[PDB]
Each structure stands twice: as structure tokens, then as C-alpha cells.
Ligand binder design. Sequence first.
Ligand code: HEM
Ligand SMILES: [Mg+2]
Ligand SMILES: [Mg+2]
Length: 426
Amino acid sequence: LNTAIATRVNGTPPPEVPIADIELGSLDFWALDDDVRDGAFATLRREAPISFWPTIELPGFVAGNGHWALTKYDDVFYASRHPDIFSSYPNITINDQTPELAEYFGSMIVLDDPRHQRLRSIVSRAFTPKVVARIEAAVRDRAHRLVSSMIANNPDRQADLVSELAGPLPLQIICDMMGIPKADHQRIFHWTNVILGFGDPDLATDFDEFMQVSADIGAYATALAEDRRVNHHDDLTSSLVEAEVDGERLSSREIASFFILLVVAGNETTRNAITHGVLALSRYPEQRDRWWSDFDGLAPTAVEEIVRWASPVVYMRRTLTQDIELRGTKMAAGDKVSLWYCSANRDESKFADPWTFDLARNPNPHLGFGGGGAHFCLGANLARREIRVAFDELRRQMPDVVATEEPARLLSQFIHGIKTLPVTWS
Ligand code: HEM
Ligand SMILES: [Mg+2]
Ligand SMILES: [Mg+2]
């Protein structure tokens, strides 16, 4: 495969970046390549581990007040485990929501306990390890077919990993858990792609399109919920419409926001873990070889290292409910605080060799699924299984699959997205 991308020397730290060249509040910065971004967070960890940044202006989104950026692992961990101080209300991105966004985006992820946990308990059983293990057959059937179709669909042995595997595998699994008919899965995926791609001109930059997509997926959720209210199915949509929280059924807004949260999170995270993982295997072939020659033994550590390496969710935001000082920086009640998982996951204070992609890494206390605590990723067991099966099917059917171009990278501060990744195999 002479068209494979260049390999890299594992363990090489990126050069640190002069602090004057770092603008977290500019979309231009998020367009820099990932070596520069990684070197910039390295500078912040060293020189300004907590620092303040203006919010990025996005068309039709309210920027509002700026935010305190926590770039060190210990601070991101602390903030995550202290939700009475670091609240998830009113929003978990840096920007402000509005009443009009709240119709569609006012889910449990932007609420504190106890209401957060009462909402989460409606669906939590479906995401537990023992229940998710039950659907291995479904994950395998879909992954196996997708990889086979990459082969059958491309006589030239060239494919886009994202559209042909990494995207459609998690999409199928979450949509089927929700109870969405197959004929509408791609419609769901287009809506979630726009919702968490906004600001990249390849996805959407007109706020009117963002609002029409949001209204359209909400109307879809409401219509499916209405069907399930009358005729139950064994799906999460039926669980949502049947549940009672504080003795009251969920409202239309609550059902639509819950539905949207689950399909967005399901569709716009694992795909990037998978795609960054194939990119990493392409750059570090010794790691591919060692996983391929002991797939079951290394899989638990390998999947977690892929998540640490990719950090598919770049950050989450909190809002202080009281004044607090951290690292000698006083922050005030009401201030926004951003938790940079991408940076925690390269912190030398926690990982001695953070720049080494090591599929055997153990322990691996990465914060790719967050810092732990009340909002710890509901889908973590699901995502780990999706990743493990995707790589197993690639190993079994096309073991030498390799990237042939550098990825087209999503322009986003929030999601470490890959839009396309050309691959080949022999
Ligand atoms: C590798 C893929 C994934 C990554 C990196 C990831 C990461 C995260 C992160 C960082 C959070 C915030 C945690 C916190 O605030 O402490 C989160 C929350 C969440 N994720 Fe995941 N996620 C992944 C896959 C999924 C999947 C497949 C689903 C399925 C629907 C999902 C559903 C959720 C939900 C519902 C929440 C909100 C939980 C709550 O507020 O209690 N995620 N995820
Ligand atoms: Mg093609
Ligand atoms: Mg079904």
C-alpha cells in the first residue's frame, strides 16, 4: 500500500507554542492542525493552567460572558466531582442557550441532581454493562456487514472510513435502541451532523438551517413518541413516554430533548474515536501489529487508549454556584468554567509518557468520558463495545486497512471530529 500516509515516531512531543499565538476564543485556532493545538495546551498547562478566554462568536448563538479554562487533569477531575460548586445548569457548552434552544436542548445534561438523576434513571438500565453486552450480536452483524460492503462497494479498494463504517455503525445501534425505523436513520444522522457540526462550512453556518434542523428532529421525536404512547414497543422512546418523574409524565419538550440528547451523543462521538483510532494505527504500525496478534487480550486497554488519544469530546462547560479559588486563581459565582479533556489527557502530572500511543497502557485514568461523577458518560459501555467490534471486524476482514490521506478535520471547539478519512487495504 504505497499510498499510505506517513508514519510518525511514537512518543514525540509536539513543540510548545508561544502563548501569544494561542486564541482559544477564535475559530481560526481550531483550524490549526492538531500538533499545534496539542502544543498550545502544553504551553497552557505549563504557563497558565487556569486562564480566561472570550467566548467564540457563532452565527445566531449568544456568546455572552467568557470562561475560565481548566487545562490540568487534577482541576478537570476536581470540577467534575464537585457538581454542587461546578453546576451543569444552564448549559454545558461555552455559549449561552435561549428559550428557543431550550425546547430541543433542555435535557438532563444541562441539569443538576436530583432532577438529573431522576431523568437518567428512566433509561440507565438500557446502558448498563450487562444489558449492552446482550446486543453484541447486533453490533457484530452491522459492523461485519459494513466492512464487507466497503469491499463489495469499492473495486478500487478505496473508501471513506467515516461514511462507510465509523459513522453508520454507532448510528444503527443507537437508532435501533431508540426504536427509529431503519428508513429514517440517515435522516437522523444528517440532523445530528448539522447540530454538532455548526460553524464548519462543510456542515452548516446559517443559524436558520440550524434552527430548522433542530425543529425537524424535535418534530420527529414528538411524532414517534405519540405513536409509542398509544402502542408500546420495547424501545427507549416507549420508556420515555411511559415514565413518571416527580409523579408527572415528561412534557413534550422533555421527551424531545431527551431523544435528541441520546441520538446526538450516540452519533457524534464514537465515530470519531473509531476514525482517530484508524489514523493512529496508520501512524504507529507497531501498535496495529501488537493488537492484531492478541486482539482479545489487548482490547480493553486498546479501546481506552484510543479514547484518551482521540478525546472525542474536547471539553465540557460548568457554571460556578459559589466563589472558588483554584491554583491561586479566584473565580466568581456565576462564572463559566471550561474543562479541557483534550488537555487533561496529555497532562504529564498524570501520564508520564502522554505523547506515546500505547494500546497496552495500564493504568489509564483518562478523562475522555469525563472526570467521573454525576454526568459520567451514559454511553461509555456502549461506545467501548462499538469501538472494540469495529476494530475486530477490520482486523478480521481487511487487516492492513490504512489511511491514504490526512483527515478532513471538523472545524469545532467542542468535538474532535473527522469528516472524511480515505483508506485502502490489499
Ligand atoms: C467514545 C465515545 C464517547 C465519548 C468520548 C463520550 C464522552 C462524553 C463526555 C465527555 C460526557 C460528559 C461527562 C461529564 O459531564 O462528566 C458524556 C455524557 C453523555 N454521553 Fe457520552 N461519549 C461517548 C459515547 C456516547 C454514546 C455512544 C452515547 C449514547 C447515547 C453517549 C451518551 C451520553 C449521555 C446521554 C451523556 C449525558 C449523561 C448525563 O448527563 O448524565 N455517549 N459523554
Ligand atoms: Mg468512494
Ligand atoms: Mg426497531
